[PDB]
Amino acid sequence: STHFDVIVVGAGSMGMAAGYQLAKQGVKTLLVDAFDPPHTNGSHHGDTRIIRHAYGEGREYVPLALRSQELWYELEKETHHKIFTKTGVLVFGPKGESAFVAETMEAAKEHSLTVDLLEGDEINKRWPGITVPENYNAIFEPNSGVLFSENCIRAYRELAEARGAKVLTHTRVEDFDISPDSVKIETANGSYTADKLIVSMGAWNSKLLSKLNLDIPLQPYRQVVGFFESDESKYSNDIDFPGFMVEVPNGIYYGFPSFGGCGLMLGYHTFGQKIDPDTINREFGVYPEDESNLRAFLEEYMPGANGELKRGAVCMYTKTLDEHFIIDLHPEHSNVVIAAGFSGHGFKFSSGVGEVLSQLALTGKTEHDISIFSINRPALKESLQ
Ligand SMILES: Cc1cc2nc3c(=O)[nH]c(=O)nc-3n(C[C@H](O)[C@H](O)[C@H](O)COP(=O)(O)OP(=O)(O)OC[C@H]3O[C@@H](n4cnc5c(N)ncnc54)[C@H](O)[C@@H]3O)c2cc1C
Numbered sequence: 001s002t003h004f005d006v007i008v009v010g011a012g013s014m015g016m017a018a019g020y021q022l023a024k025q026g027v028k029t030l031l032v033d034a035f036d037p038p039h040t041n042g043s044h045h046g047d048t049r050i051i052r053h054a055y056g057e058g059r060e061y062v063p064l065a066l067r068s069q070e071l072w073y074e075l076e077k078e079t080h081h082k083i084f085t086k087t088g089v090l091v092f093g094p095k096g097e098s099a100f101v102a103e104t105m106e107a108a109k110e111h112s113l114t115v116d117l118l119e120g121d122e123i124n125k126r127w128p129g130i131t132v133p134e135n136y137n138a139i140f141e142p143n144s145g146v147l148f149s150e151n152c153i154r155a156y157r158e159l160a161e162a163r164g165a166k167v168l169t170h171t172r173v174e175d176f177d178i179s180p181d182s183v184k185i186e187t188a189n190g191s192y193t194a195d196k197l198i199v200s201m202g203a204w205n206s207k208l209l210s211k212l213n214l215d216i217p218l219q220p221y222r223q224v225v226g227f228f229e230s231d232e233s234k235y236s237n238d239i240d241f242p243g244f245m246v247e248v249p250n251g252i253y254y255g256f257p258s259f260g261g262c263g264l265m266l267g268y269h270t271f272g273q274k275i276d277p278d279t280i281n282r283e284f285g286v287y288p289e290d291e292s293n294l295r296a297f298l299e300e301y302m303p304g305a306n307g308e309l310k311r312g313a314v315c316m317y318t319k320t321l322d323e324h325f326i327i328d329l330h331p332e333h334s335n336v337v338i339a340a341g342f343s344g345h346g347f348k349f350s351s352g353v354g355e356v357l358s359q360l361a362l363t364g365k366t367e368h369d370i371s372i373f374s375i376n377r378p379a380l381k382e383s384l385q
């Protein structure tokens, strides 16, 4: 008996950003979440996320990253919660052997991004505590950095609610009923209707998009991070130790300097367990690889950051087959917007994605170029159910 203008299902990284954008414009919005964001059951916890701009994954990503960066600076000004610290982001790998490094370097050139290029011992000299072989090269982006991701969602929620958005917590959406002129969601706490729907359920998109007659390969992965006791004279943000994402022969790792003595945090990017979001084991350390894959990197490349484990977390990626996002209207329903498959690299864009989703919901179009995120693209291996 309350009709909304827009309902957002899944008020996490993408949905809460969309909620803020909609509320800002006086759009009557309901956000429904299975938990109470920010929380520790989805893809947004573990405190910190890298934002970088030299995005070799595709041209379309660079302006989205730069717009998102400006939106994060705006958010910083709007809230009391801490949003962004400009740690810089270091990318390294073996010379001539890392597509990730090469693509990052190409992206910086193509978009005239401000970066430093260094190699071998220059890396170890600039950032004491890093020990790479002489045949490694690097590209450092001084103006990118680290987002406090739980703070971001909390701030967007507070601002959205202040403007009149309603947030229904601890409420799982179980089904959808879509009409030419309205949308309906079904939950154990009641059913709700609106003119438009945004669907942004994170790892649960892989289970519930079938309720919208969609059959899209989406695989959730269990991805752990650990915080380690570190040499603070080397690895502290206070001594300019950078965020990093790097490629070594056995994969990609990412991490964060120690903030206020929390310890250096590390994740292994290219490996995780295939899981179901409803049965995933969210306890860190239950597989020996959780800790050992991290320490194998640290002892080789960041040896003074390989101390006692201070904290672990268990988070999820949701991968598409091509590892590009899905941001598009539902092919059968122009009043339904889908945001899915962020493939372990979506958080930095979540501010810009909130803007895109807002535009798609209200106008059926966006000013951003999102062509590479089309739900109809062949590399998805997608169709209707
Ligand atoms: C360990 C780790 C490190 C990462 N590091 C980075 C990084 O450094 N840089 C970067 O850009 N990205 C990073 N990412 C990726 C980024 O965090 C994700 O791409 C992004 O958070 C996905 O956002 P989302 O809104 O799709 O999912 P979420 O933020 O998980 O939001 C989905 C929401 O949907 C809700 N929901 C689920 N089912 C229902 C239902 N049936 N009804 C109602 N609500 C429902 C959930 O409760 C949740 O709140 C990392 C991810 C992980 C796991």
Ligand SMILES: [Cl-]
Residues within 6 Å of the ligand: 043, 316, 317, 318, 319, 341, 342, 343, 344, 345, 346
């Ligand atoms: Cl993801």
